[PDB]
Design an enzyme around this catalytic site. Structure first.
Site, PDB file in Angstrom:
ATOM      1  N   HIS A   1     -14.622  -9.487  11.144  1.00 21.09           N
ATOM      2  CA  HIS A   1     -14.159  -8.198  11.300  1.00 21.09           C
ATOM      3  C   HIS A   1     -14.612  -7.620  12.536  1.00 21.09           C
ATOM      4  O   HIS A   1     -14.044  -6.771  13.228  1.00 21.09           O
ATOM      5  CB  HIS A   1     -14.630  -7.055  10.207  1.00 21.09           C
ATOM      6  CG  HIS A   1     -15.905  -6.730  10.316  1.00 21.09           C
ATOM      7  ND1 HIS A   1     -16.911  -7.706   9.928  1.00 21.09           N
ATOM      8  CD2 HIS A   1     -16.487  -5.824  10.747  1.00 21.09           C
ATOM      9  CE1 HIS A   1     -18.230  -7.129  10.142  1.00 21.09           C
ATOM     10  NE2 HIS A   1     -17.925  -5.714  10.757  1.00 21.09           N
TER      11      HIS A   1
ATOM     12  N   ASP B   1     -17.813 -15.449   6.146  1.00 21.09           N
ATOM     13  CA  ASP B   1     -17.467 -14.318   7.266  1.00 21.09           C
ATOM     14  C   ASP B   1     -17.794 -15.241   8.592  1.00 21.09           C
ATOM     15  O   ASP B   1     -19.069 -14.656   9.039  1.00 21.09           O
ATOM     16  CB  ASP B   1     -18.442 -13.233   6.913  1.00 21.09           C
ATOM     17  CG  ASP B   1     -17.802 -11.988   7.536  1.00 21.09           C
ATOM     18  OD1 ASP B   1     -16.954 -12.281   8.120  1.00 21.09           O
ATOM     19  OD2 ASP B   1     -18.213 -10.877   7.231  1.00 21.09           O
TER      20      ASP B   1
ATOM     21  N   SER C   1     -24.346  -6.980  12.045  1.00 23.50           N
ATOM     22  CA  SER C   1     -23.199  -7.968  11.866  1.00 23.50           C
ATOM     23  C   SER C   1     -22.855  -9.113  12.882  1.00 23.50           C
ATOM     24  O   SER C   1     -22.789  -8.777  14.004  1.00 23.50           O
ATOM     25  CB  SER C   1     -22.091  -7.130  11.575  1.00 23.50           C
ATOM     26  OG  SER C   1     -21.890  -6.641  10.364  1.00 23.50           O
TER      27      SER C   1
END
EC number: 3.4.21.-
Length: 198
Positions: free
Chosen positions: A39, A78, A154
């Protein structure tokens, strides 16, 4: 664990392999090649924004670099890799201003680790922070560690005691003092190495 220190100068290893995105963090892994969350890569692609090589508060930056393309990992993990144009609009070369972080075969439970990234970077003007902790759980592609993390973190590199790359952060629980990581198995190491610019 809440042991968070500012890295005020990021011109040295391993801190010069860490890059700043808008939404979080990545690691330089090889030539023109950055590893981060999905993302982080996807939302940056629709703004077409630059990445900052080891930005810190007093360091003297490694430059700001345009993204060439994005390759996502097809699986559930991810993990996305990011290619840059190596020449910045200042004329800085990407590969002269970063180091490539080494992999780290593999890890064990109860190992001491470091998480390096940009927690709340929009509020700090993107200071680099190091946070230390311990791996509590490894299961296949999953790992858990108790280093303090804020979003921010992240796609932050998780490093062992020899500055080698174990994996990256992707999720926290819930400020967070149990966080979840993508642990790099040989199969994940295969994917990353195959997508480094040559």
């Amino acid at each position: 664990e809440k042991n968070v220190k500012e890295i005020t100068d990021a011109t040295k290893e391993p801190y010069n392999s860490v890059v700043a995105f808008v939404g979080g963090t990545g690691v330089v892994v090889g030539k023109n090649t950055i590893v981060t969350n999905k993302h982080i890569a996807k939302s940056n692609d629709i703004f077409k924004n630059r990445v900052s090589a080891h930005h810190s508060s007093k360091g003297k930056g490694g430059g700001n670099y345009d993204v060439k393309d994005i390759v996502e990992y097809p699986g559930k993990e991810d993990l996305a890799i990011v290619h840059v144009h190596e020449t910045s609009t200042e004329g800085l070369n990407f590969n002269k201003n970063v180091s490539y972080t080494k992999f780290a075969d593999g890890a064990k439970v109860k190992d001491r680790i470091s998480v390096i990234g940009y927690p709340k970077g929009a509020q700090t003007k993107y200071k680099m922070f190091e946070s230390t902790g311990t791996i509590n759980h490894i299961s296949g592609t999953f790992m858990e560690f108790d280093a303090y993390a804020q979003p921010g973190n992240s796609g932050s590199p998780v490093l062992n005691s020899k500055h080698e790359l174990i994996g990256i952060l992707y999720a926290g629980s819930g400020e967070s003092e149990k966080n979840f990581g993508v642990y790099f198995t040989p199969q994940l190491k295969e994917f990353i190495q195959n997508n480094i610019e040559k």
